Design an enzyme around this catalytic site. Structure first.
Site, PDB file in Angstrom:
ATOM      1  N   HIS A  77      -9.278 -43.218 -21.047  1.00  0.00           N
ATOM      2  CA  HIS A  77      -7.991 -43.284 -20.530  1.00  0.00           C
ATOM      3  C   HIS A  77      -7.435 -44.519 -19.994  1.00  0.00           C
ATOM      4  CE1 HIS A  77      -9.854 -42.984 -16.544  1.00  0.00           C
ATOM      5  NE2 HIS A  77      -8.706 -43.483 -16.115  1.00  0.00           N
ATOM      6  N   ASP A 101     -14.097 -38.887 -21.982  1.00  0.00           N
ATOM      7  CA  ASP A 101     -13.263 -39.807 -21.454  1.00  0.00           C
ATOM      8  C   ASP A 101     -14.175 -41.300 -21.410  1.00  0.00           C
ATOM      9  OD1 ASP A 101     -11.250 -41.155 -20.542  1.00  0.00           O
ATOM     10  OD2 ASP A 101     -11.470 -40.615 -18.344  1.00  0.00           O
ATOM     11  N   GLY A 157      -8.104 -48.378 -10.406  1.00  0.00           N
ATOM     12  CA  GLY A 157      -8.359 -49.545 -11.246  1.00  0.00           C
ATOM     13  C   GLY A 157      -9.834 -49.648 -11.101  1.00  0.00           C
ATOM     14  N   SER A 159     -12.094 -47.084 -12.264  1.00  0.00           N
ATOM     15  CA  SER A 159     -12.721 -46.254 -13.662  1.00  0.00           C
ATOM     16  C   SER A 159     -13.323 -47.310 -14.610  1.00  0.00           C
ATOM     17  CB  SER A 159     -11.672 -45.408 -14.465  1.00  0.00           C
ATOM     18  OG  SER A 159     -10.674 -46.284 -14.884  1.00  0.00           O
TER      19      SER A 159
HETATM   20  C1  LIG Z   1      -8.288 -43.476  -8.379  1.00  0.00           C
HETATM   21  C2  LIG Z   1      -9.360 -43.790  -9.167  1.00  0.00           C
HETATM   22  C3  LIG Z   1      -9.765 -42.882 -10.341  1.00  0.00           C
HETATM   23  C4  LIG Z   1     -10.786 -43.289 -11.262  1.00  0.00           C
HETATM   24  C5  LIG Z   1      -9.457 -43.544 -11.611  1.00  0.00           C
HETATM   25  N1  LIG Z   1      -9.316 -42.434 -12.698  1.00  0.00           N
HETATM   26  C6  LIG Z   1      -8.043 -41.744 -13.073  1.00  0.00           C
HETATM   27  O1  LIG Z   1      -7.141 -41.873 -12.203  1.00  0.00           O
HETATM   28  C7  LIG Z   1      -8.028 -40.504 -13.874  1.00  0.00           C
HETATM   29  C8  LIG Z   1      -7.227 -40.346 -15.196  1.00  0.00           C
HETATM   30  C9  LIG Z   1      -6.937 -38.949 -15.372  1.00  0.00           C
HETATM   31  O2  LIG Z   1      -8.088 -38.418 -15.668  1.00  0.00           O
HETATM   32  C10 LIG Z   1      -8.612 -38.173 -16.847  1.00  0.00           C
HETATM   33  N2  LIG Z   1      -7.913 -38.861 -17.902  1.00  0.00           N
HETATM   34  C11 LIG Z   1      -8.442 -38.480 -18.921  1.00  0.00           C
HETATM   35  C12 LIG Z   1      -9.428 -37.843 -19.406  1.00  0.00           C
HETATM   36  O3  LIG Z   1     -10.004 -37.962 -20.677  1.00  0.00           O
HETATM   37  C13 LIG Z   1      -9.461 -38.465 -21.815  1.00  0.00           C
HETATM   38  C14 LIG Z   1     -10.129 -37.251 -18.286  1.00  0.00           C
HETATM   39  C15 LIG Z   1     -11.310 -36.655 -18.506  1.00  0.00           C
HETATM   40  C16 LIG Z   1     -12.139 -36.007 -17.570  1.00  0.00           C
HETATM   41  C17 LIG Z   1     -11.630 -36.271 -16.341  1.00  0.00           C
HETATM   42 CL1  LIG Z   1     -12.357 -35.535 -15.047  1.00  0.00          CL
HETATM   43  C18 LIG Z   1     -10.518 -36.701 -16.003  1.00  0.00           C
HETATM   44  C19 LIG Z   1      -9.779 -37.532 -17.133  1.00  0.00           C
HETATM   45  C20 LIG Z   1      -6.249 -38.749 -14.073  1.00  0.00           C
HETATM   46  N3  LIG Z   1      -7.657 -39.526 -12.820  1.00  0.00           N
HETATM   47  C21 LIG Z   1      -8.071 -39.212 -11.866  1.00  0.00           C
HETATM   48  O4  LIG Z   1      -8.600 -39.673 -11.256  1.00  0.00           O
HETATM   49  C22 LIG Z   1      -6.951 -38.115 -10.822  1.00  0.00           C
HETATM   50  N4  LIG Z   1      -7.787 -37.139 -10.618  1.00  0.00           N
HETATM   51  C23 LIG Z   1      -8.299 -35.946 -11.299  1.00  0.00           C
HETATM   52  O5  LIG Z   1      -7.869 -35.614 -12.333  1.00  0.00           O
HETATM   53  O6  LIG Z   1      -9.096 -35.344 -10.469  1.00  0.00           O
HETATM   54  C24 LIG Z   1      -9.854 -34.068 -11.054  1.00  0.00           C
HETATM   55  C25 LIG Z   1     -10.491 -34.292 -12.470  1.00  0.00           C
HETATM   56  C26 LIG Z   1     -10.851 -33.402 -10.150  1.00  0.00           C
HETATM   57  C27 LIG Z   1      -8.868 -33.024 -11.358  1.00  0.00           C
HETATM   58  C28 LIG Z   1      -6.158 -38.650  -9.826  1.00  0.00           C
HETATM   59  C29 LIG Z   1      -5.499 -39.936 -10.424  1.00  0.00           C
HETATM   60  C30 LIG Z   1      -5.009 -37.634  -9.620  1.00  0.00           C
HETATM   61  C31 LIG Z   1      -6.977 -38.951  -8.495  1.00  0.00           C
HETATM   62  C32 LIG Z   1      -8.928 -45.202 -12.115  1.00  0.00           C
HETATM   63  O7  LIG Z   1      -9.075 -45.813 -11.588  1.00  0.00           O
HETATM   64  N5  LIG Z   1      -8.028 -45.104 -13.285  1.00  0.00           N
HETATM   65  S1  LIG Z   1      -7.613 -46.386 -13.632  1.00  0.00           S
HETATM   66  O8  LIG Z   1      -6.750 -46.863 -12.825  1.00  0.00           O
HETATM   67  O9  LIG Z   1      -8.330 -47.378 -13.692  1.00  0.00           O
HETATM   68  C33 LIG Z   1      -6.558 -46.112 -15.174  1.00  0.00           C
HETATM   69  C34 LIG Z   1      -7.493 -46.699 -16.198  1.00  0.00           C
HETATM   70  C35 LIG Z   1      -6.417 -47.444 -15.889  1.00  0.00           C
END
Ligand SMILES: C=C[C@@H]1C[C@]1(NC(=O)[C@@H]1C[C@@H](Oc2ncc(OC)c3ccc(Cl)cc23)CN1C(=O)[C@@H](NC(=O)OC(C)(C)C)C(C)(C)C)C(=O)NS(=O)(=O)C1CC1
Ligand SMILES: [Zn+2]
Length: 200
Positions: A77, A101, A157, A159
């Site tokens: 993602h 992911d 940020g 992940s």
């Molecule tokens: C706050 C920090 C968290 C770790 C973080 N990841 C996220 O934001 C992720 C992305 C999205 O989920 C997913 N997308 C694609 C997938 O595959 C392609 C997924 C396959 C399996 C699963 Cl699990 C999720 C998937 C939503 N999401 C959540 O975490 C969401 N939560 C979530 O969806 O929780 C449940 C899964 C329990 C519903 C939410 C944003 C609402 C918190 C981050 O930092 N990202 S980042 O900023 O760095 C970005 C890369 C630039």
């Protein structure tokens, strides 16, 4: 449409690292935005790489990537199907799994790799892009609870960052926050066994 003017997406670019080599964990930036932008388009990155946890960026997102078993791992993602910038040009992903992911490229020359955990220990530690080390209790194959809940802002940020066991082995790659009213009480991760299955 008109193929001659169709753009190409940039490479993922290493812009810094989480330094875990000493007594103190801290983030270091190794490339500024102007340099990141140019390197993303050329895919040519001559900067020296160090450590296990890299801070990476595209034109639109920033997140982390973690070296385990000679592969730099991150989240689909964040990275999509993008190449990673390297000294001799863009390098194609060697692993891509949208269902997990998960993506991976060969680990950059100069990087160090975490060893996969075989401890079976459930006391874990999540390392964020701000070099916070967050105690996490493992609660299943792919989930862990934060000992102290944090707003999701705190984790955004991060992940692609590691969960480590007490001995510093890699247990998983941070994927998603389990959020209630904006507060992260738990985290979902790609367990290292899944990486190792993906590798075979
Ligand atoms: C706050 C920090 C968290 C770790 C973080 N990841 C996220 O934001 C992720 C992305 C999205 O989920 C997913 N997308 C694609 C997938 O595959 C392609 C997924 C396959 C399996 C699963 Cl699990 C999720 C998937 C939503 N999401 C959540 O975490 C969401 N939560 C979530 O969806 O929780 C449940 C899964 C329990 C519903 C939410 C944003 C609402 C918190 C981050 O930092 N990202 S980042 O900023 O760095 C970005 C890369 C630039
Ligand atoms: Zn271990």
């Amino acid at each position: 449409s008109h193929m001659a003017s169709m753009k190409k997406k940039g490479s993922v670019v290493i812009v810094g690292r989480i330094n875990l080599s000493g007594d103190t964990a801290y983030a270091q930036q190794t490339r500024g935005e102007e340099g990141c932008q140019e390197t993303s388009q050329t895919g040519r990155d001559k900067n020296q790489v160090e450590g296990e946890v890299q801070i990476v960026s595209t034109a639109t997102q920033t997140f982390l990537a973690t070296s385990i078993n000679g592969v730099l791992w991150t989240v689909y993602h964040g990275a999509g199907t993008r190449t990673i910038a390297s000294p001799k040009g863009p390098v194609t992903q060697m692993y891509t799994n949208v269902d997990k992911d998960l993506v991976g490229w060969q680990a950059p020359q100069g990087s160090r790799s975490l060893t996969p955990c075989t401890c079976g220990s459930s006391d874990l530690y999540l390392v964020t892009r701000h070099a916070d080390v967050i105690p996490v209790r493992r609660r299943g194959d792919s989930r862990g609870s934060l000992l102290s809940p944090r707003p999701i802002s705190y984790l955004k940020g991060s992940s692609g960052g590691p969960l480590l066991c007490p001995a510093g082995h890699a247990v998983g790659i941070f994927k998603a926050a389990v959020s209630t009213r904006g507060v992260a009480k738990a985290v979902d991760f790609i367990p290292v066994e899944s990486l190792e299955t993906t590798m075979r």
